[PDB]
């Protein structure tokens with residue numbers, strides 16, 4: 507039974523980022539009933555990226571006293587905390603407290619901090635678990651990783667703003683996390699600059715697609731109405747798996763081609779930001795072609811950058827494994843820098859404008 511190992515490894519690597527993805531795909535309904543509104547992603551990004559205090563601490567504790575380190579209790583802790591945090595988030599998302607002379611969503615923020623801590627720690631505690639398993643089972647891990655975002659997107663596309671309250675969606679999230687919990691129980695029972703270029707490009711691309719452009723998605727997309735934001739978020743989440751699949755069938759390791767596709771994706775990202783900086787009325791506002799243009803632009807941006815990410819990953823993996831470690835390091839540093847750079851632009855100076863429907 508080598509292939510049952512592959513199915514388990516897929517469904518186990520799937521849950522590595524499924525809670526944050528479910529949250530961000532349900533977000534087109536969580537806004538508009540909370541006090542924050544269009545500012546919420548701007549915090550939700552900096553919070554998720556400050557939650558990188560997790561992997562730093564796990565590495566510190568691995569370096570200080572590796573003897574006490576035990577991996578399976580760590581991962582069971584992570585998965586159980588994920589499940590309970592989802593069951594709680596089902597009930598405590600819309601609760602609002604009166605603090606600091608104003609309404610604020612403290613429960614939402616701290617529970618997002620906990621979910622982001624769990625998923626950020628999974629990133630660094632899930633790879634050295636596959637080092638002891640067979641090497642022939644290492645790839646279907648990546649299939650599960652890629653498809654981490656497909657099923658919440660499909661539940662949302664059946665939901666469709668509603669059809670059923672976010673409570674049932676979050677309970678489904680809890681059930682999926684419970685299934686990942688069950689599955690994990692069985693696994694243990696010339697010039698030097700040529701490399702620096704790839705690290706810098708991964709940092710840049712992840713800063714663009716994790717911290718910067720997600721931080722202003724409301725101003726960019728929601729101006730065309732609710733359905734524009736609905737489809738844009740859901741299909742931008744579906745478009746990363748299929749980008750990975752097309753990468754797996756038709757791969758290219760040449761640096762120039764991946765760089766040029768990066769430039770094309772960055773031009774699409776500039777078009778994504780240019781409409782945000784022009785709310786409440788961007789070009790072709792309240793027009794048929796406008797919504798399809800913005801949805802297609804988000805889909806193409808996300809796809810052409812996810813493909814580049816996966817192919818840089820294949821290059822790095824065929825070089826060595828310290829490559830993958832530093833890949834994770836650069837991904838996290840770039841995401842952090844992007845969120846920190848876009849925070850004082852959006853929030854203090856208030857360059858971006860809101861709208862009424």
Ligand SMILES: Cc1cc2nc3c(=O)[nH]c(=O)nc-3n(C[C@H](O)[C@H](O)[C@H](O)CO)c2cc1C
Nearest residue numbers: 523526527530551554651652654655716720841
């Ligand atoms: C707001 C947000 C931030 C994310 N940040 C990261 C991240 O820092 N690192 C990561 O690997 N995936 C991140 N992801 C998820 C990533 O786009 C997708 O789940 C990939 O499947 C990750 O392997 C993030 C997703 C969202 C919605």
